[PDB]
Design a protein around this ligand. Structure first.
Ligand SMILES: CC#CCOc1ccc(S(=O)(=O)CCCS)cc1
Ligand SMILES: [Zn+2]
Ligand SMILES: [Zn+2]
Length: 259
């Protein structure tokens, strides 16, 4: 039962849309790719060091399998929408999409690709309302659940095709600024945390949402952590129970060796 290493890695499709390309990668393929390679690796460090059952079940994490860089916005006909299109939807006045809407759109458009990988993830640069940084579908052990690690076919029927909810997204813009790289790390940690099966930490449970002199909140706190408190970049026990339940199962399903 011990961690069969041949299956300890969730492989990622990483997608940078033209916004991220323009404003984070400075309109360069190289600068864009290296940002994302370095980020996923740093996030992997946190996952792989996490002992999900507080015992031997550790050394699990993520690794990029494919990077997609969309250097320009997606041509689109009136009526049409696409996650990489130049205008925000629904309200085209805003800097950004409605985030739920965005994650849906991306899940539609990237369907074919997502089928080939444990998770697909969009990195974008837009200023979602209310300090929203990203979103992702929560994974589950349940044989028939939708969302999270491991592609599992679902028929929409908003889109009229199979989609996989093994997805989530990260935005590196918040309240009119590029967020710090130490903040991006945590946004993606947390968004991938949802994929891996974690819910937000309950505000009540003192143990999984500690005070500042206890080390502060953990990474699955619903409100963004500032990042400097001891607990900020770590998973709470709540998160570990939820994720262990999902992983213990889903790992056999689609996790792989490091490639
Ligand atoms: C810096 C930092 C950090 C921790 O990770 C997140 C915290 C809150 C959000 S949010 O505000 O979009 C609410 C959660 C939606 S998934 C998204 C990610
Ligand atoms: Zn914002
Ligand atoms: Zn969340």
């Amino acid at each position: 039962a011990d961690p069969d290493p041949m299956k300890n890695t969730c492989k990622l499709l990483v997608v940078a849309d033209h916004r991220f390309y323009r404003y984070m990668g400075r309109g360069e393929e190289s600068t864009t790719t290296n940002y994302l390679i370095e980020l996923i690796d740093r996030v992997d460090d946190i996952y792989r060091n996490t002992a999900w059952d507080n015992a031997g079940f550790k050394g699990y994490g993520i690794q990029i399998e494919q990077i997609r860089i969309l250097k320009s916005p997606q041509e689109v006909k009136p009526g049409e929408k696409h996650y990489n299109m130049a205008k925000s939807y629904p309200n085209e006045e805003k800097d950004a999409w409605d985030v739920k809407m965005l994650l849906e759109q991306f899940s539609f458009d990237i369907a074919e690709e997502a089928s080939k990988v444990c998770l697909a993830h969009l990195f974008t640069y837009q200023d979602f309302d209310m300090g929203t940084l990203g979103l992702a579908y929560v994974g589950s052990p349940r044989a028939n659940s939708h969302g999270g690690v491991c592609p599992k076919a679902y028929y929409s029927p908003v889109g009229k095709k199979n989609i996989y909810l093994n997805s989530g997204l990260t935005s590196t813009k918040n309240y009119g600024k590029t967020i710090l790289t130490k903040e991006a790390d945590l946004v993606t940690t947390h968004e991938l945390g949802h994929n891996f099966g974690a819910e937000h930490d309950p505000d009540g449970l003192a143990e999984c949402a500690p005070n500042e002199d206890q080390g502060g909140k953990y990474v699955m706190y619903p409100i963004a952590v500032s990042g400097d408190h001891e607990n900020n970049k770590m998973f709470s026990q709540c998160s570990k129970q939820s994720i262990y339940k999902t992983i213990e199962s889903k790992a056999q399903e689609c996790f792989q060796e490091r490639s």
